[PDB]
Swiss-Prot record:
Record family assignment: Belongs to the inositol monophosphatase superfamily.
Gene label: cysQ
Gene Ontology MF terms: 3'(2'),5'-bisphosphate nucleotidase activity; fructose 1,6-bisphosphate 1-phosphatase activity; inositol monophosphate phosphatase activity; metal ion binding
Protein name per its UniProtKB record: 3'-phosphoadenosine 5'-phosphate phosphatase
Cofactor: Mg(2+)
EC number annotated for this UniProt entry: 3.1.3.7, 3.1.3.11, 3.1.3.25
Binding site for substrate: 69, 89-92, 197
Pathway linked to the protein: Sulfur metabolism; sulfate assimilation
Main function: Phosphatase with a broad specificity. Its primary physiological function is to dephosphorylate 3'-phosphoadenosine 5'-phosphate (PAP) and 3'-phosphoadenosine 5'-phosphosulfate (PAPS). Thus, plays a role in mycobacterial sulfur metabolism, since it can serve as a key regulator of the sulfate assimilation pathway by controlling the pools of PAP and PAPS in the cell. To a lesser extent, is also able to hydrolyze inositol 1-phosphate (I-1-P), fructose 1,6-bisphosphate (FBP) (to fructose 6-phosphate (F-6-P)) and AMP in vitro, but this might not be significant in vivo.
PANTHER family per UniProt: 3'(2'),5'-BISPHOSPHATE NUCLEOTIDASE 1
Subunit architecture: Homodimer.
Binding site for Mg(2+) 1: 69, 87, 89
Swiss-Prot/TrEMBL catalytic activity: adenosine 3',5'-bisphosphate + H2O = AMP + phosphate; beta-D-fructose 1,6-bisphosphate + H2O = beta-D-fructose 6-phosphate + phosphate; a myo-inositol phosphate + H2O = myo-inositol + phosphate
Amino acid sequence: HHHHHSDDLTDAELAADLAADAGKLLLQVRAEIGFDQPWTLGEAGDRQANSLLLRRLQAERPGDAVLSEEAHDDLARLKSDRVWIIDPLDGTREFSTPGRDDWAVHIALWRRSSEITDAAVALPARGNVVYRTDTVTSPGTLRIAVSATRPPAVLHRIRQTLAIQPVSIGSAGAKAMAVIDGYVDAYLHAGGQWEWDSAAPAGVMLAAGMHASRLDGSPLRYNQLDPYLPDLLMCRAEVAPILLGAIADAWR
Ligand SMILES: Nc1ncnc2c1ncn2[C@@H]1O[C@H](COP(=O)(O)O)[C@@H](O)[C@H]1O
Ligand SMILES: [Mg+2]
Ligand SMILES: [Mg+2]
């Protein structure tokens, strides 16, 4: 009784519960199927996590649109004021590899403003820790998390002027949460990505009072017709001017 203000969860509570629940299911799938066929393992994780998440979002938020990596996109979301942007399993490659803990579940709520208002990132292999927008708290040399698979070429240019050690990690969620944790100073990506890769990490990053933008400094924009969103910078606030500047100076 008495809900929240303005099966009875706030949007942030639901984001966190969805992320944890999908996390537990993924851990079950990993234990059941095992690692002999990494392709089969990854496919099962993607498909089963997606199924759980879509079932629960229909049951618990039947009026909300959903954009998932693992489902067709009917574009009804473009007319909605409330859109869940989900990556049922981010870092499928890493999930499918024995002993790797750098994979995530991304659950973001986009709300139309006159933008990512609530979000959670689960790292199921790290004790199923769930970072959430409603509980997350607020220069000589830089540690920068980059893709273990497709690191951005632009890094090479900025390293001519800034002392940087790249830290190879799988998953956008894992790299963003390494920034929150203080394991790295920044997460930098370019060369391609999708909205569900960055929406929940961005929500958490901004809620923690940290920086999250495009490489050119402009805001990350979601619920776009084309959900391709190819580059990002997520970092401590104090680090953003240094990196955005170096990126800008790499141009000219
Ligand atoms: N160049 C790229 N184009 C499209 N998607 C990417 C690219 N690099 C990374 N991703 C996606 O971003 C997420 C994290 O990737 P990674 O940081 O490489 O583990 C995964 O969903 C990848 O498929
Ligand atoms: Mg995925
Ligand atoms: Mg992904």
